[PDB]
Write a protein that binds this ligand. Structure first.
Ligand SMILES: O=S(=O)(c1ccccc1)c1cc(Nc2cc(-c3ccccc3)[nH]n2)nc(N[C@H]2CC[C@H](O)CC2)c1
Length: 244
C-alpha cells in the first residue's frame, strides 16, 4: 500500500534492537505537495508565527516561510481540488444534501476554533475555502492582511467580530446549498444595504431543508448579540448530521 524508495531513506544511527532486527533513527525525504503564496516588512515573520500556532484539521495549515530567495513566500498545505465556490459550481447537480450539510459543518468546526482563539476571519465566503482529500473543506485566508457577506454593523459602523463572521457563514451556507450561485445576484451595493436594512433575506435554496433555512436566518439576525456563536452552530449542525 505504501512501499518506500530506499533512496529517500537515510539511516542515521541505531537506537535499539527487537528480536527480528534492530532499530534506527533515520530521515525520510518526503516530497510534500504545497501551495506557495508569493508576495509589509519583516514584522510579518511574527505574523507567520501566530498563523502557525493556529492548527486545526479544518484550517488550511501554514507550513512555513521562505525569505532567502527574492519572491518572499509563504508555504501552505496543498489542497487537492481548490476553492469551494468553483467546486460547488463545476459539480452542480451532483450533490447530496447530506454532503452539502457536511461541507457546512467542516467550515463551522474550523470557524468555532478561530472563534475560541479570538481570531476574526473578516472575509469568510466560499471562495476562501478549499476542498481537500474526500471533499473535506478547510477555511483559508484567515492569515492576511464585500457587501454580499457583510453584517449590517460591517457596512454601517465597520464593527468586525465572530458574530459578524457568523453572518458571513450564513451567507456561505446559502452558497453551499444553492451549489455556488451568487447571492443578491443582480442587486447593487446600496440595494443590498437597503433590502437587508428593510428585513429582506436570501431565499431558501431547494436543497436546503427548512430547518437548515432557520439556522441561516438565525445567522442573519440584525443585531450580532442576537446571532448564535460558532460553538453553538457547531453543536446544532453536528446534531443534524448525526441523526436521520
Ligand atoms: O484543483 S486545482 O485547480 C489543482 C491544481 C493542480 C493540481 C491539482 C489540482 C487547485 C488547487 C488549489 N489548492 C490550493 C490552494 C491553496 C492555498 C492557497 C493560499 C493559501 C493556502 C492554501 N492550497 N491549496 N488551489 C487552486 N487555486 C487557488 C489559487 C489561490 C486562491 O486563493 C484559491 C485557489 C487550484
Amino acid at each position: 500500500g505504501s512501499v518506500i524508495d530506499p533512496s529517500e531513506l537515510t539511516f542515521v544511527q541505531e537506537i535499539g534492537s527487537g528480536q527480528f532486527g534492530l532499530v534506527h533513527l533515520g530521515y525520510w525525504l518526503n516530497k510534500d505537495k504545497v501551495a506557495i503564496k508569493t508576495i509589509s516588512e519583516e514584522d510579518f515573520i511574527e505574523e507567520a508565527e501566530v498563523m502557525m500556532k493556529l492548527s486545526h484539521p479544518k484550517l488550511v495549515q501554514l507550513y512555513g516561510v521562505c525569505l532567502e530567495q527574492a519572491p518572499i513566500c509563504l508555504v501552505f498545505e496543498f489542497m487537492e481540488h481548490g476553492c469551494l465556490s468553483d467546486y460547488l459550481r463545476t459539480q452542480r447537480g451532483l450533490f447530496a444534501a447530506e454532503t452539502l450539510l457536511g461541507m457546512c459543518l467542516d467550515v463551522c468546526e474550523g470557524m468555532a476554533y478561530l472563534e475560541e482563539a479570538c481570531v476574526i476571519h473578516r472575509d469568510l465566503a466560499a471562495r476562501n475555502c478549499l476542498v481537500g482529500e474526500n471533499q473535506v473543506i478547510k477555511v483559508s485566508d484567515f492569515g492576511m492582511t464585500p457587501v454580499k457577506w457583510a453584517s449590517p454593523e460591517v457596512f454601517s459602523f465597520s464593527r468586525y467580530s465572530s458574530k459578524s463572521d457568523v453572518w458571513s457563514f450564513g451567507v456561505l451556507m446559502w452558497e453551499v446549498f444553492s451549489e455556488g450561485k451568487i447571492p443578491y445576484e443582480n442587486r447593487s451595493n446600496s440595494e443590498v444595504v437597503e433590502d437587508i436594512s428593510t428585513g429582506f433575506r436570501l431565499y431558501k435554496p431547494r436543497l436546503a431543508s427548512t430547518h437548515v433555512y432557520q439556522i441561516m436566518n438565525h445567522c442573519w439576525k440584525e443585531r450580532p448579540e442576537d446571532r448564535p456563536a460558532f460553538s453553538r452552530l457547531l453543536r446544532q449542525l453536528a446534531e443534524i448530521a448525526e441523526s436521520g
